[PDB]
Amino acid sequence: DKVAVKNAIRAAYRQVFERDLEPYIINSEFTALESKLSNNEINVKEFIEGLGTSELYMKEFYAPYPNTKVIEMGTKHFLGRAPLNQKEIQQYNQILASQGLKAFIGAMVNGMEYLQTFGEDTVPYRR
Structure with missing residues (x-):
């Protein structure tokens, strides 16, 4: 039950950031979400959205890389798969x-494919 949140x-x-974050990095922007997830006030999908919309995420996977890698990074993180094709990319770039x-982050986590593949209480994974 609690170990169940703990797991998520x-x-x-690791899914989003590819690493386990240090307590203080958590303390910076994730204190609320962990609590909500813990207190059963938001689901996994929502917490996963707190991640993509986090400032740490923009630093970690946007600040460095380019539009194409930015997008490549997001599909693998929130959809757990590479982009379908340049099309989806151009589709995403816009x-x-x-x-x-x-915007970008929301279009995936709030998308049908995501909802059908993972739902709301399942953490994305490489499919």
């Missing part, structure tokens, strides 16, 4: 170009 918190940090990062 960790699970989702999201960014018009509403920014969060």
Whole structure:
């Protein structure tokens, strides 16, 4: 039950950030979400969205890389698969170009494929 959340918190940090985050990095932006997830006030999907919309995520996977890698990184993180094709990429690039990062992040986590593949209480994984 609590170990069940415990599993997810960790699970989702490695999925998104590819690493286990240090307590203080958590203390910076994830204190609320962990609690909500813990207190059963938000689901995994939501917590996974707190991640993509985190500032740490933009630093970690946007600040460095380019539009193509930014996008390549996101599909593998939130959809657990590479981009379907340049098309989806161009399709994705425009999201960014018009509403920014969060936009992009939301289009996947709030998408049908995501909802059908993972649901709301399942952490994305490489499919």
